Amino acid sequence: TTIVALKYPGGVVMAGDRRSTQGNMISGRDVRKVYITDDYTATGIAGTAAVAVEFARLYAVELEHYEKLEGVPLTFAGKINRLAIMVRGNLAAAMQGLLALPLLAGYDIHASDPQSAGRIVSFDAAGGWNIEEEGYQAVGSGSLFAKSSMKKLYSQVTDGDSGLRVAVEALYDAADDDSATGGPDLVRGIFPTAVIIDADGAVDVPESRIAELARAIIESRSG
Amino acid sequence: TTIVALKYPGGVVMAGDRRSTQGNMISGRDVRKVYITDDYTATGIAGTAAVAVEFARLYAVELEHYEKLEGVPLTFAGKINRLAIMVRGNLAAAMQGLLALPLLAGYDIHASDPQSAGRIVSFDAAGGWNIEEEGYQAVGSGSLFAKSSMKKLYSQVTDGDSGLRVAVEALYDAADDDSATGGPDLVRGIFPTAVIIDADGAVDVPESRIAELARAIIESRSG
Amino acid sequence: TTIVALKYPGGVVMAGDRRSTQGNMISGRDVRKVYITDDYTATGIAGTAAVAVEFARLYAVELEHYEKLEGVPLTFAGKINRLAIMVRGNLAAAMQGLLALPLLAGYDIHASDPQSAGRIVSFDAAGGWNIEEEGYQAVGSGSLFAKSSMKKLYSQVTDGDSGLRVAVEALYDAADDDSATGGPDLVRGIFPTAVIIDADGAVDVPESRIAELARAIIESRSG
Amino acid sequence: TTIVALKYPGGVVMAGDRRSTQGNMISGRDVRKVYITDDYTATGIAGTAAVAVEFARLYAVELEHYEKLEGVPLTFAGKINRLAIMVRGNLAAAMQGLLALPLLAGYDIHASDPQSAGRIVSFDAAGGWNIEEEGYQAVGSGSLFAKSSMKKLYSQVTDGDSGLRVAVEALYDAADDDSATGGPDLVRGIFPTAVIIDADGAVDVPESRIAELARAIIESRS
Amino acid sequence: TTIVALKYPGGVVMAGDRRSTQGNMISGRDVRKVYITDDYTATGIAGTAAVAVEFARLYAVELEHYEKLEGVPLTFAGKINRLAIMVRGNLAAAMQGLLALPLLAGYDIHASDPQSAGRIVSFDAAGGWNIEEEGYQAVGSGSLFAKSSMKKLYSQVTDGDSGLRVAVEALYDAADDDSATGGPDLVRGIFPTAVIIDADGAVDVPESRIAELARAIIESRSG
Amino acid sequence: TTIVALKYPGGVVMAGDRRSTQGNMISGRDVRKVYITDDYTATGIAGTAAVAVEFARLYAVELEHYEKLEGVPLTFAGKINRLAIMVRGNLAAAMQGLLALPLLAGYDIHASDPQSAGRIVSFDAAGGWNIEEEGYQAVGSGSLFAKSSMKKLYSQVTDGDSGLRVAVEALYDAADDDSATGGPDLVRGIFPTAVIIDADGAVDVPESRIAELARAIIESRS
Amino acid sequence: TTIVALKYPGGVVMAGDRRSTQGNMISGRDVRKVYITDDYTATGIAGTAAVAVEFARLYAVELEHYEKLEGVPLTFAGKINRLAIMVRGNLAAAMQGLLALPLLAGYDIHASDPQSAGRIVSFDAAGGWNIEEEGYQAVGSGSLFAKSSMKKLYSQVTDGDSGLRVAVEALYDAADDDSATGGPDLVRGIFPTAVIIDADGAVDVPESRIAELARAIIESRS
Numbered sequence A, B, C, E: 001t002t003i004v005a006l007k008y009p010g011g012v013v014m015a016g017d018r019r020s021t022q023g024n025m026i027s028g029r030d031v032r033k034v035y036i037t038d039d040y041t042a043t044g045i046a047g048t049a050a051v052a053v054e055f056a057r058l059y060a061v062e063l064e065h066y067e068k069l070e071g072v073p074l075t076f077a078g079k080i081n082r083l084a085i086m087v088r089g090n091l092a093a094a095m096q097g098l099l100a101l102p103l104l105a106g107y108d109i110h111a112s113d114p115q116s117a118g119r120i121v122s123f124d125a126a127g128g129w130n131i132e133e134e135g136y137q138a139v140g141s142g143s144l145f146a147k148s149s150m151k152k153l154y155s156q157v158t159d160g161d162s163g164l165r166v167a168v169e170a171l172y173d174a175a176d177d178d179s180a181t182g183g184p185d186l187v188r189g190i191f192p193t194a195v196i197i198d199a200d201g202a203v204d205v206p207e208s209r210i211a212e213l214a215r216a217i218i219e220s221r222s223g
Numbered sequence D, F, G: 001t002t003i004v005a006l007k008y009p010g011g012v013v014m015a016g017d018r019r020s021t022q023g024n025m026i027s028g029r030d031v032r033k034v035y036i037t038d039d040y041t042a043t044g045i046a047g048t049a050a051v052a053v054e055f056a057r058l059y060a061v062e063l064e065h066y067e068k069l070e071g072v073p074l075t076f077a078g079k080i081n082r083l084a085i086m087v088r089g090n091l092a093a094a095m096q097g098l099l100a101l102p103l104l105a106g107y108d109i110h111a112s113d114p115q116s117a118g119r120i121v122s123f124d125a126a127g128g129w130n131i132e133e134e135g136y137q138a139v140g141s142g143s144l145f146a147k148s149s150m151k152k153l154y155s156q157v158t159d160g161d162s163g164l165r166v167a168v169e170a171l172y173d174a175a176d177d178d179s180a181t182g183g184p185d186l187v188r189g190i191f192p193t194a195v196i197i198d199a200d201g202a203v204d205v206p207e208s209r210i211a212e213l214a215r216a217i218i219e220s221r222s
């Protein structure tokens, strides 16, 4: 797996590959690892597919459960701490092989400056978190390759499109070096999923946009 | 890894992928797994890269050694036996992780019928061997996918050229389902290597031919 | 074991073999592994016979329990989640050898287009699941042979007849390469079972239809 | 695997299946497990394919080696002893998975009575051996089914052809109950192999003959 | 450790950091890991400091010993094989913690195509080797970061100067993300080792030149 | 990690590096390991990032919980006992890798002398504690280097400013000899955090001041 | 143990403590850890006493053996290599508790600058070595205290006498923080040993001078 997230002016983008493996064997081509967890939050999870999807579903339900009970959504800090509590709670099963490493992207409607209201929170397996200040982050087996790619491309991000393209290209590099991260499948038309989030909320990115970017990156590296 | 070999009327063909891994990490893109071991035999080996290459080089040396000492090459049976002995002798290292699983494709200059002089010999890790009589064989992490593909595609083998297209297609199905087997890389121009052996000897198939078959396969799958 | 499921225009088909083993010894010849679990759902389980049959039985009971208590059946998404929760809850026992891997086929009377209302859901030993979008899937010790067979035969599926044929022939290839999958027994008159589901519901394919399909396949492969 | 051997009046027969497995996976359909190791002797071996075949080859080479050196072939007792020693030598390796379990069938040209010149000798993994006096024997994962089938079928053996048929039928029952033992494959045309030995020596039974016997058995059970 | 090597028109460059650790403790600041092993060859080794140094020394002696014994240096192929045999020979010790993972750069005075006589050979711990064809490679705990850095920077290599700049910048990225790799030390005036090889031989890059490259990279990233 | 604390006339200072690692790999550059845990108290924590931060958070909530329930803040001794009990409660987890090892710097508003009222308390992983009488202390993988530095530089501490200088230079030496301790990052502009506590309470030290001191030490060494 | 070595203008000095322990128990008070191995070379070894002493003895015999065989002494490099090889040879024993970690000081009579002819080489348990370029080094359980002490004191080293003072004071700090390093015993009159090496060769430092410097350090810290 590789999930990436990066801040662009007035928003965040998160994107994730579509591969599922069992050892060397490809068990999935179309898995979704990035979920809109609320109107201003998307979560992307690496590790054991079953636990990862379960984390995403549970998290979204907890957030909305608080919203309906108390009349108001959690503060972003609260959302961070609830995800962190979930990860810590899973530490023992993680060490037994039921792993879930999340990566949180969101838009803080209570931030002062909308330009930097985007938030990228990374986590370790003990529940430790860090709000990232350098613009991008990644999780999963290809996360190193993706992070080193964004280290070189991130300065190209000036809007939603350039950010979405840098994310997709970072996933392209990850799949190029990590066999457990799926690259774009142009025979099948399967492409990484991506969620973008700004003041108008969190939306899924149309498959055709990501398809187009993938093709441009491929051609760019061919000739 | 996936190595495939198959008989066609008058000859035999063996093709191998190009990928190297260390866990999920892709460590090589252009490794070679099929070697012309003598004028009428090619050997393709799956397993630890160092041990595979060493096997091919030593086997080829031993065959030519016998040839120059005795004024004649070994019978095809003898060549089988020397490979089987090499494998058996490596069994204990294989048990500790230094594995070499070979696959033998050759042409028997002493067979009565030159159209059925092609030989495909598979091996197990204990040095057992079987002269494959159903037309095709594969070894490596992707070999069950490649076998099951060739099972359906083998009626298309009517000469060396459709044999080569079927070998390349089997390797394509293998890369489709096994992340330790590398598919054709159209960005970089790296394709499986292939050897074709007939009455005139064993010769390497040029890259551009395999590339052409690969693009035909991809453009067929892609509708 | 091999259980296969595949979609055809307007519905879905699931079929399973009849063999039971304890090691190399054949302990059963007519066991049933594919059950109609409700009017529009069939479940096919691989693993330990006792746990597989128990899963089918308890799952069907659970679904009907819901429908009687609330006056309406679970959504298809509900059904998926309930099965997944069963598998997950059985994990530890599975790690101790009491394994039960289901494969779920169904027709969703609440889908938009009843011609793509077919559903194929595969699972892993954790609760993890995936809705198959490529038209076929298989579970059990023959699932790789069967899926690779279907990868080559699926283009022939244009209706339930060709769907049932491709399913029975995938089970034939499976039995052909996997000794723990039983092929058609022409001496005893024992054949894989099948369920077909379309907008009229789920129905057991009568044994004689499977028999003549099996005979056709065999004669195909003899000449 | 299943290897069977039985005595008929004036000779012996041995037949073996053709299946090779790795766990549940069928890895071979045409392996040969019964070999003519000399003009009056056949060995059939169960276990690890490479070791089975290596044993047959080295055993035949060894016997013929004695024959060329000393100008005369080993007594039947000496052949038994050489096989038994070869099996005992493999014990450590066999405990690690490189198992070879032989079954010997021969005709003793120095026996007293040609009617009782047939020999069937069974072995265990320690090299212990026994000369079968009850008419038949078998070795491999299917051997119990083959032997319980022969126990009921042996009274039909009255000549070479009925003994061959009983052997093929025993192997058929073995395959019916043991998945590591391959039955007749009518689609591909692969059948058990068989050697028959009498006063004129050991020969390979032709594949057609076994095919007919198998088709007869199948039809009879349908 | 991080060692990088890359090709440029007419030559090759290799460079390595200066750091030695014992767990988290810094135990050396001026260590040297890149050695001119003969007039046209340099070796950079990661792993246990004592093994790596010993490997370099012994390998140099081996090459020159052949050269004096036979009146002629080994082919480049033979130098590869000899290093590989040395590594294989060290496998068991490597598994007990006495690792030496070499990287080979050279200039082949007998190159078929005198245009591309530069050579870069990588090695795994079993003695497997591969002649890099994509222009660069790295070895050591920082090697993934250097390889992704160079993946982004390699197009800027058009001569020995730019090639040396990209090498040192890859080292800088490596130390940026790997505490086991030492960055430049402007306080003590300690910088990475480098060697550059072309048709006129192999030469140690003066420290001052690496100092200027380090200062250019640092100012580039300060603003 | 290195956390340092040292007493100066009328106060105390605590300062911590910004590095997080997983093995050799740098996983964070800007983490905060030093926390104002109440108006007169800071805690620096070495160990597992998640457990460390959790300790600081829980501890601050606990001290204020007492204060709001009882109308008055815990004595300094009680504050120590509550941290120590927390550490002891975590010993089982700490043996399995989830380690939090704290260092307490406070100002005791109840002490006799408002110039020697600064308090530095060190802890061990069982919750044992000691009130440091020799003026300075440190914790974390770099704590030995930091302490051997302050041993030499502590005579230069005459006020809050010089004490902060010695604290940042101790952190510098720690970074020089321990790769799990981050040194000043002039390119990115990340510097150790520091808190100073005196009679006026605990206050965060402005980054720009720590940056100044770091540049002065860096220049001094070259 | 703590063994220190540092360069002064035109020479080098090496000093070591006198303590031998078994667990917590003091088992020796006057052990010598620093040995003149030849006219221009001194070696000090931490680790297992028996092995350390055996290493120093056999090493001196090795160097003198080469000198009498070849009519000339080894180059400084050669002496290094011989020690490194000896250390690598003991690696397995060391891994099982029979450890020998040496520190090497010398004056290279074949050096270019007579003032840059001092030489300090450190080693790891695998036979890795490094020629130290920053002026000082130390080995033993107290070598981090000793090296951090010398990091701060090395500026005061301007001649051989000041260098000796820094060596002894570094050892003193080592003893202050490491119970396996023995500080000056004024009651018994046992003090560290010290070799000085310059162009005129290597010499034992008289005990009276080290005792003098020791009491100066002690009185200085009260």
Ligand SMILES: Cc1cc(C(=O)N[C@@H](CC(=O)N2CCCC[C@@H]2C)C(=O)N[C@@H](C)C(=O)NCc2ccc(F)cc2F)no1
Binding pocket: A001, A019, A020, A021, A022, A027, A028, A031, A032, A033, A045, A046, A047, A048, A049, A050, A052, A053, C122, C123, C124, C125, C126, C128, C129, C130
């Ligand atoms: C005890 C156990 C482990 C497994 C296992 O390996 N399960 C695989 C997943 C898998 O084979 N599947 C096919 C069948 C239907 C469900 C699913 C899609 C996995 O989890 N593999 C890991 C290595 C993986 O690929 N994880 C990627 C991933 C991450 C987040 C996410 F949401 C989905 C994902 F696939 N199963 O049981």
Ligand SMILES: Cc1cc(C(=O)N[C@@H](CC(=O)N2CCCC[C@@H]2C)C(=O)N[C@@H](C)C(=O)NCc2ccc(F)cc2F)no1
Binding pocket: B001, B019, B020, B021, B022, B023, B027, B028, B031, B032, B033, B045, B046, B047, B048, B049, B050, B052, B053, E122, E123, E124, E125, E126, E127, E128, E129, E130
């Ligand atoms: C202890 C240890 C393990 C390994 C290891 O996994 N070594 C890899 C090989 C590797 O990482 N390499 C890049 C650097 C240079 C040489 C080579 C190309 C391997 O053997 N991996 C296996 C899984 C593999 O991919 N095998 C495929 C293969 C088959 C035949 C062949 F000739 C070459 C191949 F790469 N090495 O040391």
Ligand SMILES: Cc1cc(C(=O)N[C@@H](CC(=O)N2CCCC[C@@H]2C)C(=O)N[C@@H](C)C(=O)NCc2ccc(F)cc2F)no1
Binding pocket: C001, C019, C020, C021, C022, C027, C028, C031, C032, C033, C045, C046, C047, C048, C049, C050, C052, C053
């Ligand atoms: C703890 C334990 C397990 C077993 C065991 O392996 N029990 C076998 C089943 C068996 O010997 N039996 C005959 C008598 C009774 C009924 C049944 C039919 C099995 O579970 N074998 C597994 C490997 C198997 O063959 N599974 C195929 C299968 C799948 C789904 C299903 F519904 C039924 C099936 F037989 N025995 O004890």
Ligand SMILES: Cc1cc(C(=O)N[C@@H](CC(=O)N2CCCC[C@@H]2C)C(=O)N[C@@H](C)C(=O)NCc2ccc(F)cc2F)no1
Binding pocket: B122, B123, B124, B125, B126, B127, B128, B129, B130, D001, D019, D020, D021, D022, D027, D028, D031, D032, D033, D045, D046, D047, D048, D049, D050, D052, D053, D097
């Ligand atoms: C350590 C090890 C074991 C094995 C293994 O299981 N090897 C299988 C054999 C196999 O997969 N093969 C195909 C490829 C080449 C040769 C052979 C034909 C086996 O030995 N299986 C055993 C259980 C078996 O099936 N034995 C039947 C048998 C008996 C005698 C004989 F001569 C030949 C046979 F196949 N391989 O390495």
Ligand SMILES: Cc1cc(C(=O)N[C@@H](CC(=O)N2CCCC[C@@H]2C)C(=O)N[C@@H](C)C(=O)NCc2ccc(F)cc2F)no1
Binding pocket: D122, D123, D124, D125, D126, D127, D128, D129, D130
């Ligand atoms: C690794 C292994 C185990 C065995 C094993 O248990 N071998 C059995 C003997 C056996 O199955 N056989 C038939 C096939 C040919 C030879 C022999 C006749 C045994 O040794 N069983 C023991 C428990 C036994 O019965 N011992 C009785 C005995 C004592 C003395 C003697 F001379 C002969 C005997 F059979 N053999 O190899």
Ligand SMILES: Cc1cc(C(=O)N[C@@H](CC(=O)N2CCCC[C@@H]2C)C(=O)N[C@@H](C)C(=O)NCc2ccc(F)cc2F)no1
Binding pocket: E001, E019, E020, E021, E022, E027, E028, E031, E032, E033, E045, E046, E047, E048, E049, E050, E052, E053, G122, G123, G124, G125, G126, G128, G129, G130
């Ligand atoms: C059995 C054993 C291993 C070690 C150990 O970890 N020894 C360290 C090296 C060390 O502490 N040293 C200082 C004193 C002498 C010289 C040397 C420089 C190491 O090998 N560390 C590894 C992790 C390392 O940093 N390796 C980097 C490296 C690579 C190539 C090279 F040539 C030199 C290097 F230091 N010690 O004992």
Ligand SMILES: Cc1cc(C(=O)N[C@@H](CC(=O)N2CCCC[C@@H]2C)C(=O)N[C@@H](C)C(=O)NCc2ccc(F)cc2F)no1
Binding pocket: A122, A123, A124, A125, A126, A127, A128, A129, A130, F001, F019, F020, F021, F022, F023, F027, F028, F031, F032, F033, F034, F045, F046, F047, F048, F049, F050, F052, F053, F097
């Ligand atoms: C069981 C387990 C351990 C770990 C682990 O090693 N976790 C690392 C921390 C890490 O990789 N992270 C990035 C993303 C999330 C948040 C955090 C910042 C750690 O704890 N490393 C230790 C060695 C460490 O660096 N501790 C330093 C430290 C001390 C106090 C503090 F408050 C914060 C700190 F980072 N993960 O799971």
Ligand SMILES: Cc1cc(C(=O)N[C@@H](CC(=O)N2CCCC[C@@H]2C)C(=O)N[C@@H](C)C(=O)NCc2ccc(F)cc2F)no1
Binding pocket: G001, G019, G020, G021, G022, G027, G028, G031, G032, G033, G045, G046, G047, G048, G049, G050, G052, G053
């Ligand atoms: C089972 C066993 C224990 C030991 C052991 O610990 N042996 C001690 C030495 C000791 O107890 N002794 C008194 C009796 C006479 C010999 C000596 C003086 C040691 O080696 N302890 C280590 C920890 C130590 O203190 N080493 C200091 C040292 C270093 C170098 C040197 F040359 C001399 C030294 F004493 N050896 O074997």
